[PDB]
Design an enzyme around this catalytic site. Sequence first.
Site, PDB file in Angstrom:
ATOM      1  N   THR I   1      -6.783  -1.350   0.196  1.00 38.92           N
ATOM      2  CA  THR I   1      -7.423  -0.175   0.795  1.00 38.92           C
ATOM      3  C   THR I   1      -6.402   0.929   0.406  1.00 38.92           C
ATOM      4  O   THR I   1      -5.178   0.714   0.562  1.00 38.92           O
ATOM      5  CB  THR I   1      -7.445  -0.239   2.370  1.00 38.92           C
ATOM      6  N   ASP I  17     -10.916   5.065   1.881  1.00 43.26           N
ATOM      7  CA  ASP I  17     -12.141   4.470   1.564  1.00 43.26           C
ATOM      8  C   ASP I  17     -12.754   3.799   2.831  1.00 43.26           C
ATOM      9  O   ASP I  17     -12.037   3.609   3.811  1.00 43.26           O
ATOM     10  CB  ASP I  17     -11.975   3.517   0.353  1.00 43.26           C
ATOM     11  N   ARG I  19     -14.461   0.791   2.719  1.00 43.20           N
ATOM     12  CA  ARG I  19     -14.672  -0.606   2.411  1.00 43.20           C
ATOM     13  C   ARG I  19     -13.611  -1.425   3.036  1.00 43.20           C
ATOM     14  O   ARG I  19     -12.443  -1.114   2.862  1.00 43.20           O
ATOM     15  CB  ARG I  19     -14.678  -0.968   0.975  1.00 43.20           C
ATOM     16  N   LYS I  33     -13.132   3.578   9.028  1.00 37.05           N
ATOM     17  CA  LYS I  33     -11.760   3.113   8.985  1.00 37.05           C
ATOM     18  C   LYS I  33     -10.829   4.205   9.607  1.00 37.05           C
ATOM     19  O   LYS I  33      -9.637   3.920   9.773  1.00 37.05           O
ATOM     20  CB  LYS I  33     -11.334   2.865   7.493  1.00 37.05           C
ATOM     21  N   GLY I  47      -2.405  -3.323   6.871  1.00 33.67           N
ATOM     22  CA  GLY I  47      -1.939  -4.612   7.370  1.00 33.67           C
ATOM     23  C   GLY I  47      -3.081  -5.222   7.990  1.00 33.67           C
ATOM     24  O   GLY I  47      -4.168  -5.168   7.439  1.00 33.67           O
ATOM     25  N   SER I 129      -2.064  -1.176   0.434  1.00 29.44           N
ATOM     26  CA  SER I 129      -2.193  -1.912  -0.808  1.00 29.44           C
ATOM     27  C   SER I 129      -2.145  -0.907  -1.937  1.00 29.44           C
ATOM     28  O   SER I 129      -1.516  -1.043  -3.018  1.00 29.44           O
ATOM     29  CB  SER I 129      -3.543  -2.709  -0.927  1.00 29.44           C
ATOM     30  N   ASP I 166      -6.910  -0.167  -7.993  1.00 27.55           N
ATOM     31  CA  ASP I 166      -6.937  -1.175  -6.980  1.00 27.55           C
ATOM     32  C   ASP I 166      -8.293  -1.696  -6.834  1.00 27.55           C
ATOM     33  O   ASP I 166      -9.232  -1.013  -7.207  1.00 27.55           O
ATOM     34  CB  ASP I 166      -6.503  -0.844  -5.571  1.00 27.55           C
ATOM     35  N   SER I 169      -9.795  -1.221  -2.676  1.00 27.46           N
ATOM     36  CA  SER I 169     -10.478   0.014  -2.347  1.00 27.46           C
ATOM     37  C   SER I 169     -11.708   0.049  -3.222  1.00 27.46           C
ATOM     38  O   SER I 169     -11.938  -0.799  -4.051  1.00 27.46           O
ATOM     39  CB  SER I 169      -9.648   1.351  -2.433  1.00 27.46           C
TER      40      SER I 169
END
Lengths: 248, 196, 195, 232, 241, 204, 244, 245, 226
Positions: I1, I17, I19, I33, I47, I129, I166, I169
Amino acid sequence: DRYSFSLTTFSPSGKLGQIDYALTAVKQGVTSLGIKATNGVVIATEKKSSSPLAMSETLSKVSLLTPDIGAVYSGMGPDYRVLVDKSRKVAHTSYKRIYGEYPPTKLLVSEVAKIMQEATQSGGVRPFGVSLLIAGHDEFNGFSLYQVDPSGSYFPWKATAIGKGSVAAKTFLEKRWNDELELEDAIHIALLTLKESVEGEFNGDTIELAIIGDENPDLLGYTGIPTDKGPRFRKLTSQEINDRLEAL
Amino acid sequence: TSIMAVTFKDGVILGADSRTTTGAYIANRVTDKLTRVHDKIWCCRSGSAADTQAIADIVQYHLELYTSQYGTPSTETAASVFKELCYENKDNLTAGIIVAGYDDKNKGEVYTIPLGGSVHKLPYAIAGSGSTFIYGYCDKNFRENMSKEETVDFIKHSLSQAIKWDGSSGGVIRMVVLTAAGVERLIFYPDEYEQL
Amino acid sequence: MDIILGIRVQDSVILASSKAVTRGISVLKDSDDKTRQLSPHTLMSFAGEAGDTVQFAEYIQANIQLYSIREDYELSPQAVSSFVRQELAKSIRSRRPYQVNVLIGGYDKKKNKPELYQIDYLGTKVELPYGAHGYSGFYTFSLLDHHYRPDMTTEEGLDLLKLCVQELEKRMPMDFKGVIVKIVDKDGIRQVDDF
Amino acid sequence: RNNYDGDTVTFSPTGRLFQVEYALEAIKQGSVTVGLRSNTHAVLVALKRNADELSSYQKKIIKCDEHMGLSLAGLAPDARVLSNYLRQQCNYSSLVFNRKLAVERAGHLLCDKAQKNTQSYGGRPYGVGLLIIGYDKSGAHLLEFQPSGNVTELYGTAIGARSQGAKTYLERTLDTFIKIDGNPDELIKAGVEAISQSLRDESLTVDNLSIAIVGKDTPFTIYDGEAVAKYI
Amino acid sequence: RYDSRTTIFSPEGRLYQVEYALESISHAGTAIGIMASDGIVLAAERKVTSTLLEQDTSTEKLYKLNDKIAVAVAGLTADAEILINTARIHAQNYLKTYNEDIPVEILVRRLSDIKQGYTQHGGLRPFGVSFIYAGYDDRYGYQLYTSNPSGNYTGWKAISVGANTSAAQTLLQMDYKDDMKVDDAIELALKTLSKTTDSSALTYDRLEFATIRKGANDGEVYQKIFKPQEIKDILVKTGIT
Amino acid sequence: SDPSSINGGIVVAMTGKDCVAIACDLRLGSQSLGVSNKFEKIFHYGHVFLGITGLATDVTTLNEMFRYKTNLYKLKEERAIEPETFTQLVSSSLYERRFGPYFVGPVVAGINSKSGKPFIAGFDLIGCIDEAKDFIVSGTASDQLFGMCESLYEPNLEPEDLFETISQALLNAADRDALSGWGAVVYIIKKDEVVKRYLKMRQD
Amino acid sequence: SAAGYDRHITIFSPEGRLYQVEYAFKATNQTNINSLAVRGKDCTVVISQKKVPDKLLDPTTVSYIFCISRTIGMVVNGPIPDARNAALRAKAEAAEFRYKYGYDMPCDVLAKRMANLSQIYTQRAYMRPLGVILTFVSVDEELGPSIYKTDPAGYYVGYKATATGPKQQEITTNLENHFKKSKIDHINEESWEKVVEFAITHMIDALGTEFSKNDLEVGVATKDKFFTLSAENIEERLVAIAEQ
Amino acid sequence: IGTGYDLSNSVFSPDGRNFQVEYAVKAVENGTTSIGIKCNDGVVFAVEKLITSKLLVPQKNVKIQVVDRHIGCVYSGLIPDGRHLVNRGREEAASFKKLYKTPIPIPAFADRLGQYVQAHTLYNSVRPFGVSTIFGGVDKNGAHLYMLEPSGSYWGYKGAATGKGRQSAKAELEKLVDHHPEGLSAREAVKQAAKIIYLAHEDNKEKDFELEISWCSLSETNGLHKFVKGDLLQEAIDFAQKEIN
Amino acid sequence: TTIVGVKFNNGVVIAADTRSTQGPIVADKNCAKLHRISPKIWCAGAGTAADTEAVTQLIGSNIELHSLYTSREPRVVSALQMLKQHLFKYQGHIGAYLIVAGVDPTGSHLFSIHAHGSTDVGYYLSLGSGSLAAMAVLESHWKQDLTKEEAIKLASDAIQAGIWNDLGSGSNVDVCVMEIGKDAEYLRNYLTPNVREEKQKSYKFPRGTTAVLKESIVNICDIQEE
């Protein structure tokens, strides 16, 4: 006599002396009142300055327990503040993890009641000095108003009043109340009733009047969500009260 | 990462490197490692950012309360306070603190508390994993009771060497000068420092 | 080692339990009581982990007897089976376990049907009229249900059970030293000899 | 008024409590003991009481340690709680510090313990006086413990019934027994003379005498029967 | 006097405290539960009223503690709230533990131990409340009990508490038909409520009512607190309105 | 992996258009041993349906647990518990234990009565808000089902259309999983009507 | 009345109130000290009398203005025992608040938590109310200059200016005239030193008594700080008035 | 009196005092004279311990007790009750040393002792204290002298006095402000302390006394408190007797 | 993410994002989120998903009481300082990894928090991430002094770049701008880089293509009695 040097025993005509004194303590307070309508709820109180130099503008006697529910009191000033503190804490715990947003009006009243009750229960504890009014708005029972007694019982009402001028306010409300009122109409009843109590000082600087109606995304502090509901509670300023106070 | 404080004739100058590292990735290259705990007394943080941040906070409220009730704290006083947290949590927590302060009655002081802790008086202390390299440098080139300018220049060159032999030292060299002229932060760019 | 068997017939529940108890490499006795009556018309056969069976059996028996005696009329097999299961479900979340699997075979007088429940060591109450635990249920889930005629009597179920036992000795390296078969009916609980 | 005759948590107009005052009464109805000391010895002589002549008489000497010991005059229930406490402290000093507890130091612990019950509204306040002897590094010492908690180091003192004649024996002969050192015999005889005068409308008997002695050369020993019919 | 703690006894070998709780009932509203083979009715009377009182969208002296058992209140209302909440918690423990609904005899029995416990232990009040329990269990069918403020229970087929218990009781036992019906319970209750109450025209906004039935929509029990207009229908049959 | 993986079992809930389906398998197994061919994993408190996957104990124990809390909620407020509000509750209740966390993967589904909108929500061991208007699948065959349900889903469907989609989904995915299957049952909450349709499928 | 009532704070009277709390509002007359708090536009000022009546008492140990924390002063009126008790709890809580919440504890919030504290002492019969009146002064970062007075009851309310003591009234009336005529609730000058001159003048007229440097102690709260003035600094302000 | 107001310590009078706290002050008055004299480089403490009979042992019973090795405290009133406030005081002292690795400043001690007295008036089940306590020493800021009331009031002093013969002491202390506006130096104040207690013993006359003096002085006891005994005390005794005559 | 928080000289904007990725399975395509601490304090989680969600509600309630007590707009130091002591106690056994962003009348602020917790005061930050992906964009496309429109183009680019690089995401970028003393305008679906590809076939069938052993009717609506 001994039925309020002790809390164990009762009068043979019912009830502790402590409860009947706790009501005396209510009337020694400012006057507060609420009127329910079918598109709104007005809540109104007076504030005694009790010094030309005292600022009652800095502490108002209408306080949000949660954003959709405000409360007033009539009775002892110190006793109100801690009691309000506990209202804010229990509310998050009891339903802002069960429903993830602030409680029903109805629920918070049953909670408050248990606290008042527990101080009527045993010796070496005294009743609270106030009777509160809790007004609020939820979508599950709609608009509501309540009176919460320091005996440990609570009653829902359409309009009621408490304080020093209660007995005058109650007959007044009976006459002017109708089956459908508007929010504006209920504000116009609320000013007249409280003015019977105090006259020669009535202005919106000294009288605080506020409403629970519809959402305010303006007091919410955010926008951009299609489902957001801002504070049902709303404060009118000193200037707005004057516009209604002229309208009489 | 490397931290030092060196006493001088009118104060104490804290020196520290700003890079904070989790593994070989730098978390942030501008962390202020020199943290106020009291008006005239500041602590240096090295080691783990997380452990040293928490132990400073606890002591921060305590030395506030000391100032109100029990009169003005000393560096000496401060250093022990950190000892109690460090000694009981010597296995839970790993906390590197250089405890530097300024009195108008005891001048600048530098006290250094290991991991285990213990209060030790030194003319300068140096602590961290970037302190190892610059020891010999500072040992020879310590002049005692040297000018304000002489302190800042000394520290600047010592820490330059720490940055050359550690990549977790680096960033900008921040300094807190606790003196009777106030609290003056300083910052030193890599353009200034590396040629030196 | 340590098997418990169960069949529900249409007028009785028949529980069987091994007479064998092994601690170490030693069979301690060839006669061991390993089934207890909770009340005079509800029977618990039990098997499971070393000496937990003994502590747990007496603990559970005493509670059911208290509630039967308290109410002044013995509780249903339905009330009994949740309670036992709930003790187990607390224990695996507590700092001390009991891992004891059990069967409740009661005759329910409340609605007049025999009732076999299967209660797991895990602590899972599920109703099954052919339930069985440990290593027994690996052989008798299939044996009972192959021969199983949709209506059953005490006579029919006993020959089929005896047969089940006769398979277990043969294909396990075990010894159960026969099994005692206690029959749960509307006339109370009785012991009847079998292979 | 004497609204204070019930409250031990509420000052009486004099600045006392009546409870502390009544506690001195308890000592007066209590059984007589005479203390005295010298540099190298200290002795307690106490009267045993009886209710009849089929009684085998009340121990008035409790061995606290093998070098320290006490006697009582007043409430025996209150005497028990404080004796328990007192042995616990002397054994503590021999356990951790390999040390004899000083007479004076013991007494300061007992002080906090009296006044705790005065401060509280819970449990009885004390009503027994203890005459304490020991022999430590600073030679023999004699303390008079009061149920208030006041601890007083003297060369001789007495508590219990009709104890004002023991103080008069001791005052006159104050110096005789400072000069005697190393003679346990002499110091024992001096308490016996002392408690004859203290008493009125009584006489001493063999089995009314319990004499307890510790010094620098004399171990802590209690003498009874034929070991106290030598000094009657 | 004996008034200081509940750890004492008066010379009747009871306590004066118990008498004081008794009297608390006889200044509250009147309460009547009449049992029949075909359903049990619970009824209570309101002890405050106004026209600006909300009492048409609410009840206050009627709580369901589980979907098979209901209670009525007579006594102070301040006392009531605490013990209702505890009975209901005890019911859901029963449901959690045994996988079934509690018996009437236990639920009442517990509650009775708890009242006595505040007499037994400490200087804490007795709780001057009388609750009418109307329940179902498949062991003794319908069961009507009431709980004393002293803290004991006694079984029933009809009972009245509240104000003017004696007056009410004689009137109930006179008109009790021996098979009984839920429709006759409902009818009897209004008649009896009228004469005790100090109003001459009893009304539905002055009424709380719940009828419990398994005799229609069998094999299951459905308990219904009545809505105000339905209460009005039954009043019209008794000829009050 | 976890205990939830040893016992297994699947509960899948889905949304169409003013409807939900929540369906389950009838397999309870305890490891290698199959235990019941008939233990239903669907339970309900009013209109809110709670599925439970995971270890066998927590299927029975949590059911008792959430029953307790919805019964006090129902009586006091005099209304039905809502799926919108139950999602809040499941996540906090499971989070109460974190140092002894319950090993399950629930699925909540119901339809709100204060708007008629369909609600499905997904959870894990200690539960989190996972919002969908498509589908939430759970269990040891969840990785199969996540794709199977996406693949057959066509947005905006009839109550009768939604049956077809959830049935074909369950049918192959449960079968081609070790620890799942052994019968299935489908609950189609049309709005407030619930029809129960048992899937004839093989015994796994 | 008296039958239980006054002997407790858990026994209400026939009025519903507590006589015993109200008797502490009569405990400010026993120490015979007066305060004056006024706000300037950027500052808050507090001046209370200092009583040295004996030459065996140093002027610097007798003070009633206490540093509670960095930006927070407080004046105490009334008895020396309840003075200390209030002071401790206010220092322990202010220090604790400041790092827990990372905010400098505003005048409203300190006055608030203490008023709450005072209410808790009154509900149990084990504890007792405070006797002292605490008038908190701070310049807040969220409201600028503020005065909140907390009463021995657990009332707290804001004030333009406030006064306390046995002769409290006479000062009150003087401040009434001043803010009312000007139509501002502040002392108009912007310098904290010149505000302190005005406040000293109002008091000397009002009480009728000229004060000295060792008959005042003055704390002055400025933007995010507090400091208490020493006698020679106070003298400079006094003579400022005396000679124009 | 009646109607509460002294019957508990919670309850308050309409006057602004508490008559139960007034009888505690009477108990300080009844106790034996103690004085403390602040100096421009130390503190001197003296106490009158009266001799009632010669059965007492001389120089063995006192009201002078030390706290750390540099804070002297001396008490008047109820004798075991003054001991106890010192015993708790000693506990409080130790805590501070362990945590901050520094000797306690005297005003710090001053805060901490008065919190113990105050706790004993918040509860109707705790009898107050009934002792005043003269105290002080030499610290970071030099020498300081304090006294604490059984009210739970305290302030700093140049000369302090308590007990029965406190009427004389107060007068001699005043003569001293005028005589020395430094409050007298610490060396000559040991002799000044003895003379004071002798005029105070004229108010106790029917009995004999024993005089104990202690001191703590910056550079004439070296920052540490030690007992005045020996040839020192006898010189103090000789000065007193001479000037009284 | 990818999570980014970017301070600017008028406010702060935080973006992420929508997702949810829990392991190698996409848990939800869209989900909010952005978690609420308070109405001008919005924050995003990294995390553990369950732990960052769970913590932000408990804390955020304590900041809300404090928001009424002070009768002021809510403060970011108070939020951060409570997370900072709280996360420490269980010593990473409950983690929560957050970009905290909010506004106050003392100005705009930006923080990071760890599992144990420590302060990092940045001008621009990224966490998760997609910390390593985002960083290079925040550093190098950075101008001394940002404003509102600038701060968000730099922020959006950084999410879209981390959508490419990534795989934790993707989907739509949800945004929240918090400008000092001015309402927090939540711009969910601000930048949508999510393209979509439709099925080439139908997957709905007439009935009887599933087999029905038996049917049953259960209620969820209560009974009457009349």
